[PDB]
């Protein structure tokens, strides 16, 4: 046994592949339950230095940021805050119970609990410090969990910064859960289905007031995707059409009078009329019965529901081989692009009450757009629903049978008259069929949330009139009603798609309105829209162009933001500067006054070269200089020693020496700017001086207040008040959250022979 | 469609089996089409058949060829 | 000291194309009465592209 | 139908290239004119027929 081997480095062509789903396989959502309490700040022991610069026998706790990671440059800082907003929205919970995250305080009077692990860590650390007052220890002993179970409410202690309190309190007071009772189980189902006596409903549970439920955001199409987004509309339309085909029942018990086409037509018609997808016709003119059933079709289904050339060909054929040859007329002289379809001109040319009233009805058959229960609906005439249209049709066919054909031979008479007798011997079955289609159509329309617009699509579905003839010729005394499981499935699916649609709209609108309220000017508002379509797992994002995304952006700008996102963003707006004044890696500017100014006393540093008011000296913005490099101003002002300020995020180093003060180094940093113009290699010096600086004997003995050129514009940390930083977070106690809401309902149908329509009269009765 | 206005370009493409444009893109194009068509139906045997045709194109994308020569293969 | 062939200053900024697309949207919204329908829908959508 | 979100302007190196080239062409043009004109005029003033 033996082998030999050879290989070949084939290139690796990778498409984008645009990973899809279909509607029945879209998973609804996954709730965000909260982890730890989203701190941004934490305390920390730092030393402290009394005025004159030297050190205490005591320490002190200051607020500092978690994860100093902030960039250089205001653009990248605003990127940071956009990402932070993304983090908060990624962490924004839907519901949260505090008891899951609570822990036990090891230093409480009553042996009580608190909210988070780090709170208790801080409490224990501050308890075990030697140099903390007794009052905070008393405080730690008093802070415990309180409960009032009459209201199902808890109040837990927390220790966290006021911005953090703002965020967590907003989550608490605006967590979207609502009390759940059986009335809400009912009222989540549509009205028309509860008011329909062909379905019976019950449940085997009595939910408590402790239950909860999340309400979907079933707000309508803000974007108007029927208006000039016809590719997306064709996609959505097909993607609902296919879903509609999945839920229509399969049917029960001479060219092409088979089954499998009756089902195809029964499925195709309803799914088209629910999806509002146009459909085109193919039909062989040697089969006249195809036309004779297309008559019925064009009657009971509107004409704007079809694409124009199809029904033009069908109506033209019908005229020129059943009607005008029977009454002894010319064939026709019809233009391709005639603005009237043949039935319209034929409505007025003939003189016969039955056919003319029929053609009037047919030409003026069109949907009724009515807004019911929030959703639009394309309701039929209320003469099609109750099957009576077939009586007009059959009267016309009887008044055609009685005609002679003065122009055409008797074999042709025999063919035509035989066909229309094959359809006239099915009066009751066709009336019943029409009632059945209307009923199933409205009943399935009731399980819709997204409004159903009437605009012709790019692409059609081929309907064969042979299949229509199969339908019209194979049906009798057996009724198909949609099973409640298909109904509930269709409704939950439309709900999940609609809620995904609205929530992702709200996402993209939030980020867009953020980015336009922060001057993020290099950013390109494409990837957001790509994410918006990716999370809608049905579109081909790799082959939608950029203009369409940008027009979608143009519509998205004008929308209001939802309440959660707008409030969180208002918080971030008012506190982004405060967050940025912290982070002692980068400073918020630098003054340059070619003059020997004084250093300010502080007590987490000692003597520092810090400024916190910026009055006096004029300020240069640096992003304007980075955008448009024109260094004439800064260069002229630096060479001639003119005082100036430089505003913009900037790193620094903490030179804790003293000999680098008398040597005046922090003015040396600017002479590179004339050689190399790029103000990126710019790091001022911060002259922190104290009893931990190796040369402090000078400041101790010689009695000189330190002085320095080139102060820094910066704010100090905020002192940690253990008493005032403690808060009480309020919430509910022990609710439950249910998502698949129609699991508690069991449902069944009446016997299909014992059905009934809007008129309170049995469908599928005529024999 | 022949006259002194038009032309015709005709081309023998019989050696274009080992070519670099009949490998990966061809198979992946058909695979993508099958994905679209699979999302364009609801019945399950059809999805199985289509997924099998797809997987056939997956397996045929890497393909070795037995040829003996004396003792070794 | 050099001659130069300059533009109308509604082109140096892009503003006249707004008027073009308003006109073209109008042509899109209109029928083509004599014309057939497949070639008409195709032209209308091809205009709405630009 | 294939454009968006990419501003392209001449690099200054390209501008200097295209200006030096146009300058050189114009200068060569005028200088060879002057040389040719002088030699022609001298051939017609020195009676070279």
Detailed description of the structure:
Chain D: Belongs to the rotavirus VP2 family. The structure is cut from a larger assembly and holds three copies of chain A and one copy of chain B (about 70 residues). Chain A has about 775 residues and is of the alpha/beta class. Chain A has one domain. Helices cover about 40% and strands about 15% of the residues of chain A. In chain A, a hairpin with a 5-residue loop joins strand 1 (about 40-50) and strand 2 (about 55-65). Chain A is elongated, with a radius of gyration of 39 Å. Chain A starts with about 40 loop residues before the first strand and ends in an 18-residue tail after the last strand. Chain B is mostly helical and about 70 residues long. Chain B is about 45% helix and about 0% strand. Chain B has two helices and no strands. Chain B has helices spanning about 25-40, 45-60. Chain B is flat. The interface of A and B includes residues 2, 13 and 538 of A.
Number of DSSP-assigned strands of chain B: 0
Helix percent band of chain B = 40-55%
Number of helices of chain A: 27
Beta-strand level of the residues of chain A, as a percent range? 5-15%
Spatial extent as radius of gyration of chain B: 20 Å
Radius of gyration computed on alpha carbons of chain A: 39 Å
First-to-last CA distance of chain B: 53 Å
Number of strands of chain A: 27
Number of helices, where a helix is a run of at least 4 consecutive DSSP H or I residues of chain B = 2
Number of structural domains of chain A: 1
Structural class call of chain B reads mainly alpha
Q: Estimate the global geometry of chain B from the Cα principal axes.
A: flat
Largest interface: A-B, 18 and 15 residues
PDB class: viral protein/transferase/rna
Keywords: Rotavirus, RNA-dependent RNA polymerase, VP1, VP2, VIRAL PROTEIN-TRANSFERASE-RNA complex
Entry title: In situ structure of rotavirus VP1 RNA-dependent RNA polymerase (DLP_RNA)
Chains A, C, D: Inner capsid protein VP2
